[PDB]
Structure formats: structure tokens, C-alpha cells
């Protein structure tokens, strides 16, 4: 498998899509956790190395393994210069 920390520079859009949470279904993948369902090709996420499939373990150091969808969204939009995402791949 693999684990990677991705640093995304940042207000405007991330160019990713998430599914999952402790409260919703990961319809594309009953796997628990928040998952990147989609990556805008040539978007911020895409370029920065993010990949469809990646499970989001943590946003700017906040454990979101067990996060709800809304909590993961909240954390992904908190204002910041550097958005740091720890993900698992494969």
C-alpha cells in the first residue's frame, strides 16, 4: 500500500470530490473513512499528486479517519495558506 503527505497551496477550488464519512456510504468503493471520489484533471488536487481512491486520514494534522462527511468538508475548507493532507493509497 502507501502513505503520503500532500501539500496543496491555496479560497478557490480544490478540484477534488469526496465520498464517505462515519455517516455516509462509499458507494464507489462498506469501506470506512473519507475517500477522494474524483480529481479534477489538471486541477489543484490533481497536480499536487492527489489521486482518485486516496483515503483521507488527516487534514492539516486533524485526524479524520473517523470523521463525518461534514466534518471532513469543514476541515478541508478551513482557511489556510497550506492545505496538508495525509492519505493512504492503493
Amino acid at each position: 500500500g502507501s502513505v503520503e503527505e500532500i501539500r496543496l497551496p491555496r479560497g478557490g477550488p480544490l478540484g477534488l470530490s469526496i465520498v464517505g464519512g462515519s455517516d455516509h456510504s462509499s458507494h464507489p468503493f462498506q469501506e470506512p473513512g473519507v475517500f477522494i471520489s474524483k480529481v479534477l484533471p489538471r486541477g489543484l488536487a490533481a497536480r499536487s499528486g492527489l489521486r482518485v481512491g486516496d483515503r483521507i486520514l488527516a487534514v492539516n494534522g486533524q485526524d479524520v479517519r473517523d470523521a463525518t462527511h461534514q466534518e471532513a468538508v469543514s476541515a478541508l475548507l478551513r482557511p489556510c495558506l497550506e492545505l496538508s493532507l495525509l492519505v493512504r493509497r492503493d
Binding site: 465520498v19 456510504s25 458507494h27 474524483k38
Partner: peptide, 8 residues
């Protein structure tokens, strides 16, 4: 469950 995708 309910699927739910958020584009960001």
C-alpha cells in the same frame, strides 16, 4: 446508507 459526493 445514503451516498453523497461533495465537489470542492
Amino acid at each position: 446508507r445514503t451516498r453523497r459526493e461533495t465537489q470542492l
